[PDB]
Design a binder for this molecule. Structure first.
Ligand SMILES: C=CC1=C(C(=O)O)N2C(=O)[C@@H](NC(=O)/C(=N\OCC(=O)O)c3csc(N)n3)[C@H]2SC1
Ligand SMILES: C=CC1=C(C(=O)O)N2C(=O)[C@@H](NC(=O)/C(=N\OCC(=O)O)c3csc(N)n3)[C@H]2SC1
Length: 159
């Protein structure tokens, strides 16, 4: 993969909104969203968040992420990490996490990145572990069926 990045643009939204393939996937990247996902929901997230970024390969938007918390001199918390179905497992999420870590260090002078991952998302837990994140706490949350799920709160020092 040769990947590049840029700020998300309006033109990208229909593409990104296409990424979650089912209710679970949507929940694991955007738990406040309601299925079906839509550009309006995505745009509403972008408006209340920062650092909405896309990753591009061979002319295709393949990844998206942003921050849902940002505290200058302190930390940022990664949100909305989404990858195109055809590009899963090819390093897009790793690439984007690295871009977002740089953004957190550079723009927000953060010392820490926080990532919170739902317990069912084994691939996410394993990837963030590979990238140097450690688990710090587990919180109870509820899924759309009202079932209890565990949110694994991980973090990583940035420099
Ligand atoms: C005239 C040709 C058209 C073509 C064509 O077939 O040549 N289309 C497509 O392939 C359809 N694309 C979209 O719905 C689209 N994103 O696709 C989602 C994805 O990439 O997964 C979109 C619409 S508005 C916007 N900002 N993005 C239509 S658009 C009309
Ligand atoms: C993986 C993506 C995540 C995203 C994201 O990028 O969208 N998050 C947010 O915006 C954070 N909000 C929640 O924890 C949350 N809302 O209440 C917030 C609170 O209690 O403090 C929630 C989750 S399930 C439920 N019933 N509520 C995390 S959860 C991880």
């Amino acid at each position: 993969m040769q990947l590049s990045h840029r700020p998300a643009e309006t033109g990208d939204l229909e593409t990104v909104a296409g990424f979650p393939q089912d209710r679970d996937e949507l929940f694991y990247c955007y738990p406040k969203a309601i299925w079906p996902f839509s550009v309006a929901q995505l745009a509403a997230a972008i408006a209340e968040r920062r650092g909405s970024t896309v990753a591009v390969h061979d002319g295709q938007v393949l990844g998206f992420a942003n921050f849902y918390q940002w505290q200058h001199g302190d930390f940022c918390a990664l949100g909305n990490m989404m990858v195109a179905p055809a590009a899963r497992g090819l390093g897009v999420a790793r690439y984007l996490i690295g871009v977002m870590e740089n953004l957190a260090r550079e723009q927000y002078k953060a010392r820490l990145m926080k990532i919170s991952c739902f317990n069912a998302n084994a691939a996410g837990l394993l990837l963030y572990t590979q990238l140097g994140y450690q688990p710090r706490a587990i919180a109870e949350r509820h899924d759309p069926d009202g079932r209890r799920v565990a949110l694994i709160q991980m973090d990583k020092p940035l420099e």
